[PDB]
Amino acid sequence: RDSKRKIIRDLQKQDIQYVEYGDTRTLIIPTDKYFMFSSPRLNEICYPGLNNVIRLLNFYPQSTIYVAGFTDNVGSRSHKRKLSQAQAETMMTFLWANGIAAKRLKAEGYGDKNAISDNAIIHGSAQNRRIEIQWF
Amino acid sequence: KFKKPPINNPSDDATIKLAEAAVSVSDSMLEMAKVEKVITPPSKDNTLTIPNAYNLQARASVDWSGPIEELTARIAKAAHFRFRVLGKSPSVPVLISISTKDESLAEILRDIDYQAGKKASIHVYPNSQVVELRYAKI
Amino acid sequence: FKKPPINNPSDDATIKLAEAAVSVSDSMLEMAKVEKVITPPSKDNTLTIPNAYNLQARASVDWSGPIEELTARIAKAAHFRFRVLGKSPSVPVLISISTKDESLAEILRDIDYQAGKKASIHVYPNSQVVELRYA
Amino acid sequence: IPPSANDLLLHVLEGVPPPGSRRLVVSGGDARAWLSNEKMYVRTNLTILSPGWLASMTSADGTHAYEMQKSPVLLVSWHGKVMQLKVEG
Amino acid sequence: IPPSANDLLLHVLEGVPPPGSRRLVVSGGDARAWLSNEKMYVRTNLTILSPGWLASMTSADGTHAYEMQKSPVLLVSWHGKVMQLKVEG
Amino acid sequence: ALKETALSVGAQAGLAWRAKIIDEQLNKQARNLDAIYDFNSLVLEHNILPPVLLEGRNTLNLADAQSIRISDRTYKVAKQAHFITTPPTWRQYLWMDYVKPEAPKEIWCIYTERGWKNGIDQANTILEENIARIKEDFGGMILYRKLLAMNMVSPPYVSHTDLGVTGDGSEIHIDDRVLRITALPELNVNSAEWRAAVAK
Amino acid sequence: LPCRVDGACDATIIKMMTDLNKKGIKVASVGQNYLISIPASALFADQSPRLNWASYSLLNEIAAFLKQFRKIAITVTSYSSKYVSVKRERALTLARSRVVSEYLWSQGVDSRIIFTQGLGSDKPITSYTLGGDRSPNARVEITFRRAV
Amino acid sequence: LPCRVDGACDATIIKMMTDLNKKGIKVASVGQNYLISIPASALFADQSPRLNWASYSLLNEIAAFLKQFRKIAITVTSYSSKYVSVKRERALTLARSRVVSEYLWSQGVDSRIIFTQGLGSDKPITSYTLGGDRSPNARVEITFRRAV
C-alpha cells in the first residue's frame, strides 16, 4: 500500500522515469518541469514526487550514484555544458541536503552529447532535456 | 501501463516553425559571433568607464523597448544620480530594448551602453552623482 | 500555497524559442562587445569642471548658433574674462543648446564637446577666464 | 539637393491641420493625423515605430510631426511598452 | 558560355518561392516545390533521384535547390531507402 | 456546384479563422519575436539598413549534355544598403491580415469543413512563407556584416556635407546637414585582400 | 470595440483593500501613488530571506491586485530591525526584497521596471523597538504610481 | 489516400510489451530509443550458439514487433558469462549474435543496417555471478531508435 511497488507506481503517476534493471537503477528527470526555466532553480512546486524520490532512494542506501544533466542542441557548447552543470549541482546538492553521503554522489551535466532522443523534433527534444540517475 | 516522462501542453505548427526558424538563425549568430570575435580582438571593457558604487548596487529587473533617455532618467532617479547629457540628440531616436531580469544597475548600464553601441555612451561619475549620456556626433 | 508562473514556457516549442531568444541575445551582446570601441576615462580629453564659485551657478539657455558670442556672455555672466585664441572659420561652429537648470561648467563642458576638434574650451579659474581655442 | 523638410511640418508641428486636409480618425491614442495628399502628417509626442516618415520633425518641446506614408495601423512606443494604433480614413 | 546557375536558385535556396510562382502541393514529404515557369524549383534536403534538374544548388548546410523539369512524381533517396513523392499542380 | 460553393463557404471560413488564430499567437510571442529580431543591432552608423546577401554552394547548372557550369560558392547582393528611418520589425512581415466574413445539404456541411481545413492550411503555408521571408532578410544582412567582416564586401562610403544657417528672411534653417551615401556596399573581387578567420 | 474596463473593476479593487486591511496589510492609496506596507514577520522567517507556504496565497493575491492598474515601474524595498551587522541587515533586506521581487516578477507584473532594495531599518518608522523580527520595522514595502 | 497508421496500432504495441514483460523479456522504451534485453538461457543452449525449437514463436513475434516502427539501423550484441577463453566467449557471443541476426534479417527486417557483435560479458550488468549460462550476463540485447 506504500511499498516499493506502490511508490514506483505513483512515481510514474508523477512520471519520473524509473528504471529498475540489474542493480543499477536509473532515474530520468524532465528538467523542465522539475526546474524553473533556464535556471538552476528547482521547481519547488513539484515537491511530492521528490519526497518519494528520496523515499525510494533510501531503499538502496549504500549505492553510489551517477547523475547527469542534459540539454538540447542549442546555444554554445560552453553554454550547454555550463547550464547542465548548474542543473547537475543543484540536484546533487539537493541530495546532499536530503541527507545522502556526499561521497556516494557523482554528477555530470552533459550538454546533449548523448541524446536518448533526437533534437530535430520537438517532442524528442522534450524527451532530451533530462537527468540521469544511475546507481548500483 | 507505460509512459514517457515529458508530457507538455499541446503546441501548434506556428510556434513550431517559428522555433526552427529561430534556431537556425541563432546558430548562424553563434558562428557569426565566433568569426567576428576572432577577426577582431576585443581590447578593453567598459567597466572602467562604468565602475560600480554603493547604491548603484541596487538591483532591477526590466523590460523595455523604447528610447534611451527616458529609461536612463528612470534609472538615475532610482539611483539618486543626477543625470546629464552631452551632445544633441539625433533626429532618429536611439531606440533600445533591454529585457532582462535581476541584475545590478551597473551591468544594466553596461548592456545599455553596448546596446547603444556607437550611437550613445554612458559615463558615470559616482564620486559625484553623475550619470551622463554622451550622444554620437554625426 | 503558491501558483505556477503564468508566462512559462510550458510547451515544448515555447521552451525552444525561449532559449533561442536567450542565445541570440547573448550572441548579439558579444557582437556589441567586440564592436563597441570606447575611450578610457583617463584619456577622454573633455573639459573638466574648473570648480570656481563664480562658475558654480545654475543657469538656463535655449539657443543655437555660433559658440563664441554665447560663451562670451557665459563668461560675462560668470564674471570671467573671455579670450579667444585662433581664427573663427568662415562656417561657424554652431552649438545647439536647450536647457533649463544647470551649471555654467556643464555649459562649458558640452559646448567643448560639441566643439569637438574644431574648437576647444580652456578655463583658468586662477585668473578667472575662459579661452576659446580654435583648430 | 534634397528638400529641407516640409514646411507643412511646421504647421502640423502645432495642432493646425495642413490646408485641405482630412482629419484622420485616430482611435486609441493622443496623436492626431491628417490626410493631406496620400501623406498623413501626424502630430504626436509618442515615438513612431512601424511605418517611417518621409520627413520628421519635432518642436522645441519634443512634439513630433511626421510626414508619413499612409498607414491604417500605426506603431509607437509609449514607455518601452509598444502600442498599435488604428486610424480611420 | 553556359549560365552559372539560376539566381532564383539562390532564392529558393531558402524558403522563398520565386517571384510569380505557384505552390506545388507536395504530398508525402518535406520538400517544397514551386512552379515558376514550367520549371519547378524544389527546395529540400533530400536527395533527388529520378528526374534531374537543370540546375542544382545547395546551401551552406546542404539545403538543395533544384531547378527541375516538371514531374508529377518525384524520387528521392531518404536513407538508402528510396521515396516516391506525389505533387499536385 | 452546390458542391463547390459549399467548399468555398468553408474555404475563406477556415482561412480567416486560421488568420485570427495565428494573429493571437503572434501577439503573445511578440516579445520573443523581436527578441530574436533585433534589427537595430544590425543597422549601421547613419541608420543605414544593411543589404541582404545571399549564399551559394555547388551552383551547378548543366547548361546541357555537353557543358556544365558550377560554382563552388556564390554570393548575391540583394536590396542594397540604404538610409532607413525606422528600423524594421517583424509585424511588417508576419502580422497576418485578419478579416471576418460570414457572408453566404450534407454536402454543404462536409464541404464547408473541407474548405475549413483547406483555408486553414493554406494560411499555414502562407505563414510559413512569411517566416521564410523574414529569414532570408535577416540572414542576408547578417551576411553583409559577415563579408564586411571578411573584407568580402565594402562599406557604405558616404559623404555628409553640412550647411550652416540656411534660409531667407521668411524661412531659415540654422543647421542643414545633408547626407549622401556616395559608394554603396559591394562584393570586392580582389580576394587577396580578404579576411579569413580561423577559429578555436 | 475598445475597452471601457481594462479587464478590471473598481469594486473588486475596493473589495481587496477592505479585506486586506481587515487583514491589516496596509494599503496606502495616496494622491496618485499607491503603496503597500507589510510586516515582514508574516512572510520571511526570523532573519531569513526565506518565505513560507501559506503566505503565497496572500502574495499572489497581491499580484492579482497589481494587475488592476496600468503601471510602469514598481519599487520594492524592505526593512529589518537591526540584528547583527550593518552589512547583513542590508543583505537580509536586500535578499528579502529580491526574492519576493523575483517571485512577483515571475508572477503577473505589468510594470516595465522593478527596482529592488532594502535597508537594515535605517529609517525605522517606529522607534518602539520591541525586539527583532516582530518589530514593524521588520517590514517590506512596495510603491507604485498608477499610470494614467 | 495516404496513411494514418502505417499498418500498425499502438494498442498492439502495448499489448506486446505488457505480455512480454509478463514473460519477462525486457523491453526498454527510453527517450526515443527502444531496447530489448533477453536472457540467452531461454534461447541458446549451454555455451552453444545453437537455438532451440519453441523459442522461434517468441523470436518471430519479436520480429513482428520490429515491424511496428519505421527504423534504420538495428544493433544486436550478446554477452556471455566467462566460460573458458576470451577468444571463445567472444566467439560464442559473436556467433550467437550473428545467428539470431541472420534469422531475423531473413525474417522481417525494416532496418537498412544491422550491426552485430557480442562480448564475453566484458561489461557484466550484474556481478552476482551465480554461474555460467544461467547468469543474466549470459544475454542478448537489441537496440534501435524508432525512426521519426
DSSP assignment string, B16-84: HHHHHHHHHHHHHHHHHHHHHHHHS-----STTTS---TTTS-EEEEE--SBHHHHHHHHHHHTTPEEE
Q: Which residues 6+ apart lie within 8 Å of F197 measured at CB?
A: B35, B36, B38, B39, F149, F150
Grid look-up 507536395 returns E26
Neighbouring chains to G with at least 3 Cβ pairs closer than 8 Å:
B, C, D
**Residue G96: closest CA among G81, G115, G74, G76:** G76
Neighbours of C100 (CB within 10 A): 9
User: D 7-36 residues with CB below 8 A of G?
Assistant: 27-28
Longest dimension (CA), chain A: 47
Task: Give me the half-sphere count of Cα atoms (radius 13 Å) on the Cβ side of residue E79.
Answer: 10
The CA distance from B4 to A73, in Å, is 20
Q: Is G16 on the interface with D (CB under 8 A)?
A: no
B 4-23 → H contacts, CB under 8 A = 4
d(CA H122, CA H81): 9
Which 3 state secondary structure label does DSSP give D33?
strand
CA-nearest residue of chain C to B28?
C24
Contact C94 F41 (CB under 8 A): no
Residues of E in contact with F67 (CB under 8 A): 2
Whether C92 and F164 lie within 8 Å, measured CB to CB: yes
CA distance H146 to chain E (A): 14
Give the CA radius of gyration of chain C.
Answer: 24
Touch between D and B (at least 3 CB pairs under 8 Å): yes
Rounded Cα gap, residues E5 and E70, in angstroms: 18
For residues D4 and D21, give the distance between their C-alpha atoms in angstroms, rounded to a whole number: 22
Please write down the HEC assignment for all residues of chain G.
Answer: CCCCCCCCCHHHHHHHHHHHHHCCCEEEEECCEEEEEEEHHHCECCCCCCECCCHHHHHHHHHHHHCCCCEEEEEEEEECCCCCCHHHHHHHHHHHHHHHHHHHHHCCCCCCEEEEEEECCCCCCCCCCCCCCCCCCCEEEEEEEECC
The CA-atom distances, in angstroms, between B99 and each of B23, B52, C6, C25 are 20, 21, 17, 9
E strand or H helix at F14: helix F2-28
Q: Beta strands C129-134 and C81-85: pairing type?
A: parallel
**Rounded alpha-carbon distances, angstroms, from residue H132 to F194, H45, H137:** 68, 11, 9
- What is the CB-side half-sphere exposure of residue D59 using CA atoms within 13 A? 15
In Å, how far is G107's CA from the nearest CA of chain D?
Answer: 18
By the CB < 8 Å criterion, does E4 face chain H?
no
Cell numbers describing residue A67 = 547523475
| Closest in C1, C2, C6 to G108, CB measured | C6
Residues 12-51 of F with CB under 8 A from D: none
Q: What is the C-alpha to C-alpha distance for residues F176 and C91, in angstroms, rounded to an integer? A: 12
Q: Which of F135, F144, F181 is nearest to F50 (CA)?
A: F144
CB B60 within 8 A of CB B80: no
Tell me the structure's resolution in angstroms, rounded to a single decimal: 4.2
Nearest to D24 by CA among D37, D5, D11: D37
Count of CB atoms situated within 10 Å of the CB of H102: 12
D81: its cell numbers: 511598452
Nearest of F150, B82, D88, E28 to residue H2 by alpha carbon: E28
Cell numbers that stand for H21 in this block:
514483460
Q: What's the number of CA atoms in the CB half-sphere (13 Å) around residue E20?
A: 4
Sign of CA dihedral E46, E47, E49, E51: positive
Tell me if G116 and B58 make a contact (CB, 8 A cut-off): yes
Residues in chain F within 8 Å Cβ distance of B35: 146, 149-150, 197, 199
Please answer whether residues H74 and H142 qualify as being in contact, where contact means their C-beta atoms are separated by less than 8 angstroms.
yes
Beta bridge partners of C130: C82, C123
CB-count exposure of residue G91 (10 Å: 0-12, 13-18, 19+): middle
CA separation for the pair G141, G121 (Å, rounded): 12
Method: cryo-EM
The verdict on C2 touching A (C-beta cutoff 8 Å) is yes
- Bridge pairing between strands A105-110 and A65-70: parallel
For residue A24, the chain H residues in CB contact (below 8 A) are: 125
DSSP one-letter code for A44: G
Query: Which of C22, B78, D28, B112 shows the shortest CA–CA distance to G72?
Result: B78
Of B5, B8, B11, the CB nearest to A16: B5
Q: Can you tell me the distance from the alpha carbon of F93 to that of F131, in angstroms, rounded to the nearest whole number?
A: 8
Task: Report chain G residues whose CB lies below 8 A from the CB of D84.
Answer: none
The backbone torsions φ and ψ at residue B25, rounded to the nearest 5 degrees and listed phi first, read -70, -30
Residue F86 to residue D1, Cβ atoms within 8 A: no
Phi-psi region of E62 (alpha: psi -120 to 50; beta: other; left: phi over 0): left
Q: Is E70 left (phi over 0), alpha (psi -120 to 50) or beta?
A: beta
Q: Give the best residue of F21, F23, F32 to mutate against chain B (max B CB count within 10 A).
A: F32
Q: Cβ C30–B37 below 8 Å, yes or no?
A: yes
Q: HSE on the CB side for A59, CA within 13 Å?
A: 14
Residue type, F174: I
**CB interface of F with E, residues 155-174, below 8 Å:** none
Chain B residues within an 8 Å CB radius of H29 = 2, 4
Q: What is the DSSP letter of E16?
A: P
* Residue numbers in A near B16 (CB within 8 A): 122
Chain G interface, Cβ < 8 Å to C: 53-54, 56-57, 59-60, 106-108
Listing DSSP states for C41-54 in one string gives GGG--PPPP---SS
Query: Measured between alpha carbons, how far is H148 from H137 in angstroms, rounded to an integer?
Result: 32
Residue A77 identity (one-letter amino acid): R
Q: What are the grid coordinates assigned to B53, written together?
A: 558604487
| Amino acid present at C123 | V
Q: Which residue of H has its CA nearest to B3?
A: H29
> Distance between CA G105 and CA G126 in Å, rounded?
30
Cα dihedral angle (G17, G21, G25, G27), rounded to 10 degrees?
A: 50
State the Cα–Cα distance between residues F11 and B5, nearest whole angstrom.
Answer: 39
CA distance A12 to chain B (A): 8
Q: Report the gap between the CA of F132 and the closest CA in chain E (Å).
A: 5
Question: Can you read off the three cell numbers belonging to residue C63?
Answer: 539657443
Distance from CA of H63 to the nearest CA of A (A): 23
Chain B, window 74-133: residues with a beta carbon less than 8 angstroms from a chain C beta carbon = 84-88, 99, 111, 113-115, 117-118, 121, 123
DSSP conformation class of H25 = P
What's the residue count for chain A?
136
Whether chain B has a CB inside 8 Å of the CB on F133: the answer is no
A32 touches chain C (CB under 8 A): yes
- Distance from CA of residue C112 to its chain's centroid? 9
Residue of E nearest to H73 (CA): E79
Yes or no, beta carbons of A17 and H30 under 8 Å apart: yes
| φ, ψ for residue H47, nearest 5 deg | 60, 20
Nearest beta carbon to residue B6 from set A12, A74, A126:
A126
**Touching check for C31 and chain A: CB below 8 Å?**
no
Contact flag D49-F92 (C-beta cutoff 8 Å): no
Contact F164 C32 (CB under 8 A): no
- Could you tell me the three cell numbers for F4? 463547390
